[PDB]
Design a protein around this ligand. Structure first.
Ligand SMILES: CC(=O)N[C@H](CCCCNC(=O)CSCCNC(=O)CCNC(=O)[C@H](O)C(C)(C)COP(=O)(O)OP(=O)(O)OC[C@H]1O[C@@H](n2cnc3c(N)ncnc32)[C@H](O)[C@@H]1OP(=O)(O)O)C(N)=O
Ligand SMILES: [Zn+2]
Ligand SMILES: [Zn+2]
Ligand SMILES: [Zn+2]
Ligand SMILES: [Zn+2]
Ligand SMILES: [Zn+2]
Length: 534
């Protein structure tokens, strides 16, 4: 039952009383807001019988003062926890409209204002009591990591320590500077993730843009394709009995799905801010889907450091994609511009509450804004809504409009099972976009291999994992931890197991040479660049 920290930091009652008293004093200094808290709550004075059936562990400034004065706190966190218990009791019994609730919120704002730097000066991260967002009476706490050398407990998310990266345990920032050796660099980074021709093109597109701007807060951006696989869309049994039972359209359609993410350095750490799953139907795919792409899902977390260039870099990513698929041989883009349902996430588990979900018109206008700039850039020849293309290119049969996986139309055709379908086309005409890469020969060849990654094969896997692991994207601090964890998941959970080969030799070798300039220059001496003995 007993533990052993020989060099553990203990605070004498007067050392913590010296440091924690200013913070408690600042609360008492707030008149009249601290007045219903300066003494314990009295249900007989207030006519509130049910108080002790709601608040089970009462707390108030006076009890916290008595504990502080008579040294009943051994380490700061017991003080910190008791104030938040008093605050949490007020937010509980008193309604959000209440004066006491507002009074409590003011005290809490001043507690946050003072407690953070005092805890920081005493070798801690912050003085806040954190909890995870509710899922599905009782909430989940934030994890803590105890310093190996000093024993000081810290919020795991504050300090960004994950064991799988640093297995020698966690040692606090100041302990490392007492020895004179800085922390061991995180190798599970976005920059280190497997480079792909597509991702490189997209990150060049955004890095050249912000290089031209030279914005102060702007951090380096990394776009990586984390999963790439060959999937198949099977035609639904309804439309299958009308066109597949004959020979008008194929029973299935081949596409390559690719999940891809965008990351940026914020305070020297990787923060993920953009997600996107696409469907690419190649040259050997039967009609209608031949040579077309389809943005299946897209998501974002608004913590992009220079908040001004935020939508400029989202648009530059979306435009770099179209410049890429077009260049290698695709002809039409397809976006179902629909926002997510209330309280539902596309890719990133827990969105920030202060992050505004655009209205369907705003989303259409945002996509519209992106496409016009790409037209001027001479990437997209032209674009039109689904109705202005089914009547310009003359469509009369169901088999003529593209059939994508999880798209609206493949499921709406199944609804017309008892019977007007061209009438549904102009109702939602602004939602569906048809992009033209070419106006009007050799087959497509994706140079990139296939990234096998179960977590990014479909949105559901990453969304469910983060939900169980509590990897939220609700705060910048919480997004930094969720990115830290998702990067180790993509690294360690790497389903692809490599077999390296040399370039000029073309042999499967174990001992090799790798220069510090090219992307993957492996060579067998059995070139101008300086090689490394790997
Ligand atoms: C059956 C079924 O399940 N069916 C489903 C159907 C799924 C359909 C398939 N979906 C797709 O294919 C994807 S199309 C896009 C989907 N939506 C999303 O990506 C999620 C929303 N979040 C975002 O990623 C971003 O908002 C983004 C779209 C990237 C635009 O970035 P932004 O930078 O432009 O921000 P803003 O929020 O638009 O607005 C930018 C400004 O507008 C402000 N703003 C935004 N919305 C509002 C608003 N509501 N009220 C007031 N202001 C508002 C915001 O505060 C801000 O201001 P500031 O510049 O001062 O900061 C199924 N199959 O699963
Ligand atoms: Zn903390
Ligand atoms: Zn320490
Ligand atoms: Zn700006
Ligand atoms: Zn060789
Ligand atoms: Zn080289």
């Amino acid at each position: 039952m007993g533990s052993s920290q020989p060099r553990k930091k203990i605070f004498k009652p007067e050392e913590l009383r010296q440091a924690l008293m200013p913070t408690l004093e600042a609360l008492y200094r707030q008149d009249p807001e601290s007045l219903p808290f300066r003494q314990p709550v009295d249900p007989q004075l207030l006519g509130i019988p049910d108080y002790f059936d709601i608040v089970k562990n009462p707390m108030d400034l006076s009890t916290i003062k008595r504990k502080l004065d008579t040294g009943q706190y051994q380490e700061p966190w017991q003080y910190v926890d008791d104030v938040w218990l008093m605050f949490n009791n007020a937010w509980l019994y008193n309604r959000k409209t209440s004066r006491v609730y507002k009074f409590c919120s003011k005290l809490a704002e001043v507690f946050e204002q003072e407690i953070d730097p005092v805890m920081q000066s005493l070798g801690y991260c912050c003085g806040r009591k954190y909890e995870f967002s509710p899922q599905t009476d009782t909430l989940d706490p934030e994890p803590f990591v105890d310093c190996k050398e000093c024993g000081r407990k810290m919020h795991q998310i504050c300090v960004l320590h994950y064991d799988i990266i640093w297995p020698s345990g966690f040692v606090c920032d100041n302990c490392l500077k007492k020895t004179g050796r800085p922390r061991k660099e995180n190798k599970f980074s976005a920059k280190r993730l497997q480079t792909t021709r597509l991702g490189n093109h997209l990150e060049d597109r955004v890095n050249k843009f912000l290089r031209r701007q030279n914005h102060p807060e702007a951090g380096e951006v990394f776009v990586r394709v984390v999963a790439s696989s060959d999937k198949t869309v099977e035609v639904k049994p309804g439309m299958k009995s009308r066109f597949v039972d004959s020979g008008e359209m194929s029973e299935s359609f081949p596409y390559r799905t690719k999940a891809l993410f965008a990351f940026e350095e914020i305070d020297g750490v990787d923060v993920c801010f953009f997600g996107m799953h696409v469907q690419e139907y190649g040259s050997d795919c039967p009609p209608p889907n031949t040579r077309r792409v389809y943005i299946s899902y897209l998501d974002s977390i608004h913590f992009f450091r220079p908040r001004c260039l935020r939508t400029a870099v989202y648009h530059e990513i979306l435009i770099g994609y179209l410049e890429y698929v077009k260049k290698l041989g695709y002809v039409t883009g397809h976006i179902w511009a629909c926002p997510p349902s209330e309280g539902d996430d596309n890719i990133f588990h827990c969105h920030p509450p202060d992050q505004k979900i655009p209205k369907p018109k705003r989303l259409q206008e945002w996509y519209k804004k992106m496409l016009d700039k790409a037209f001027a850039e001479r990437i997209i020849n032209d674009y039109k809504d689904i109705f202005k293309q089914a009547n310009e290119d003359r469509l009369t049969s169901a088999k003529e409009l593209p059939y994508f996986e999880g798209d609206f139309w493949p499921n709406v055709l199944e609804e017309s099972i008892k019977e007007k379908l061209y009438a549904t086309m102009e109702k939602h005409k602004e939602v569906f976009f048809v992009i033209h890469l070419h106006a009007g020969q050799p087959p497509i060849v994706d140079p990139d291999p296939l990234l096998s990654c179960d977590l990014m094969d479909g949105r559901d896997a990453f969304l469910t994992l983060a939900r169980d692991k509590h990897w939220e994207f609700s705060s910048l601090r919480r997004s930094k931890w969720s990115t830290l964890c998702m990067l180790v998941e993509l690294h360690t959970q790497g389903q692809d197991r490599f077999v390296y080969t040399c370039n000029e030799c073309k042999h499967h070798v174990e001992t090799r040479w790798h220069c510090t300039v090219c992307e993957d220059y492996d060579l067998c001496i059995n070139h101008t660049h300086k090689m490394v003995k790997w």
